Every structure is written in structure tokens, then in C-alpha cells.
Amino acid sequence: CIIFFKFDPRPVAYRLILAANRDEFYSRPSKLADFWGNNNEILSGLDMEEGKEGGTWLGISTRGKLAALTNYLQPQLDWQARGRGELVTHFLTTDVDSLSYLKKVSMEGHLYNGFNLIAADLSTAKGDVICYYGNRGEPDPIVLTPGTYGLSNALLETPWRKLCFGKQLFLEAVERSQALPKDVLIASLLDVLNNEEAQLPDPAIEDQGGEYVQPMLSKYAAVCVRCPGYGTRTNTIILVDADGHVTFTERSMMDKDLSHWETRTYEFTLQS
């Protein structure tokens, strides 16, 4: 997976520009993004793996909650651990602020396989807040300062070459698009997320992934990952403009087919 986001709580301009790839085994059942929840207020794709249905990796609510998760690359997993898909879902469905929520997750981080979690509260009145915690890094969640961040399958801002390369492409796309309609920005960011140029060698990927990543290395080290049976299945763009207007674009691989894709774009305004 790889996520880039620029956030600016005091637009002088977008409050949030987010571009994310979900990398996963192509066999894992998923539902394309649509609204769900008791008031139809949550927008996200959904995991449909048997026994883990309703988890997700990225979502936003019309009340302004946003969260995102990436797995931490490991040579071996604990198959008895709690599933990570509930971490985003539980934030989106409850009324706990991002920092308090991550503090509670941190107390239980040892119950999951490795993960990175971003949780955000978007409030046109109270001021946006974005926090970060991962259970393979420091124990305390942090409150992020405004800026442009990258997150892949190490920790926040770990300088994997694919992260550094993707971040520069992301920033260039934002700059190229500045004086143009939002459709150009979204198009430019979809192009970034489909860049398959591997950034190698990467000793950091090799060290963290051990033997597991060796047969994947030549493809894993790109923004858009194309491995046998595994790779970039979803491209998601989320824009929040200064007025709280949200645009959510999800492009999804269909029928396990690299030539079949479906993209959905939704618009809504953040509610107070």
C-alpha cells in the first residue's frame, strides 16, 4: 500500500488532498465504495473476507471523520491475531476524537499484526486534526503538523525509495494542477498512483521484508505494485476543499483482470 496526503487546516486551497493505493492479494473479496452506516453517512469500500466482513482500509464520514490503515511488512504473520480491518471501521462509526481513539488503540496494539493508522477529525469550525499511530513504532500517537506526508508498509515517512519517488510525483501533480478544475487534479493523481517504475535497490525494504519480500522485490518497490496474484487493486483520491466540499474517487480492479476497472466518484459536503 502507499498513501500520500497534503493537509492544511488553515487554507489561505484544499484542506486535504489524499491519494492512496491499496495493495492486496487479488483473491480477497471486496465491495466497491458506497455509502453505508445507520444514517448512510460513511463512505468506503469494504472487506468481504469471510469472518472479517465490514472491515476497511480507508474511509470518510459526512461528519468529518477520516481514517486510513496500511499493513506493516513482516516476514511472518500471527494468524490468531485480531483482524486490522476493524481499526478504521470503529473510528468511523463512533464519536471519539482521533487522538483519544489512537490512544485506546495503542493500549491494544499488541493484539494485531503490524499496522499503521491515520485518524483525522475534519471540522470546518473546530479546525482539522490528523493523528498517527503504528504498533511497530513508538507507543504514543502523535498529532501531525500541516504538511505533505507519505505512508507505505514501514512507518510514517520511512524513506523507502518508492515513497520518496511517489511523494515527488504527488507534489508535482498537485503543482501542475493548481490553476485547473479539480478533474485535472484527480486525473493527475490517478496517473501517479499507476506509476509502475520500480525504485531499486532498496535495502530498507530488503531488511524489513526478509526472505518473504525477496521474490516480490522487483515489483514491490514501485508505487503501483504488479506481483503474481498480488498488487495495487484500488486507487483512491479524497479531496476536501476549503469550504468542506468532499470529492471521493475510487478506481477498482474488476474480475481479477488488469484490463477491467471501475471508477466511482461521489461528492458531498461535510456536516457540522
Task: Measure the CA–CA gap between 87 and 65, rounded to whole angstroms.
Answer: 13
**Which amino acid is located at 204 in the chain?**
A
Task: Measure the CA–CA gap between 170 and 114, rounded to whole angstroms.
Answer: 26
| Residue the block writes with cell 466482513 | 53
Nearest to 236 by CA among 67, 55, 10, 26: 67
Alpha helix positions (H), 115-247: 161-176, 182-193, 203-213, 217-220
| Residue the block writes with cell 514501514 | 154
Written as one string, the DSSP assignment of 58-86 is EEEETTSEEEEEEEPP-SS--TTSBPTHH
**Which amino acid is located at 95 in the chain?**
D
Task: Measure the CA–CA gap between 145 and 202, rounded to whole angstroms.
Answer: 28
Experimental resolution (Å) = 1.5
Task: Measure the CA–CA gap between 119 and 239, rounded to whole angstroms.
Answer: 16
Quote the Cα angle for 212-19-123, to 5°: 125
PDB experimental method? X-ray
Residue 150 C-alpha cell reads as 507519505
C-alpha torsion 21→231→35→109, nearest 10: -80
What is the C-alpha radius of gyration for the chain, rounded to an integer number of angstroms? 17
The β-bridge relationship of strands 2-7 and 14-25 is antiparallel
Task: Measure the CA–CA gap between 221 and 266, rounded to whole angstroms.
Answer: 31
Under 8 Å between Cβ of 30 and 18: no
Residue 216 C-alpha cell reads as 516480490
Task: Measure the CA–CA gap between 79 and 198, rounded to whole angstroms.
Answer: 30
CB crowding 82-98: b at 16 or more within 10 Å, else e: eebbbbbbebbbeeebb
**Which amino acid is located at 155 in the chain?**
L
- CATH classification code of 2-158+233-269: 3.60.60.10
Task: Measure the CA–CA gap between 98 and 101, rounded to whole angstroms.
Answer: 5
Under 8 Å between Cβ of 240 and 122: yes
**Would you tell me the crossing angle of helices 161-176 and 182-193 to the nearest 10 degrees?**
160
Under 8 Å between Cβ of 20 and 58: yes
Query: DSSP character for 57?
Result: S
Under 8 Å between Cβ of 251 and 190: yes
Nearest to 24 by CA among 252, 248, 186, 262: 252
Under 8 Å between Cβ of 258 and 34: no
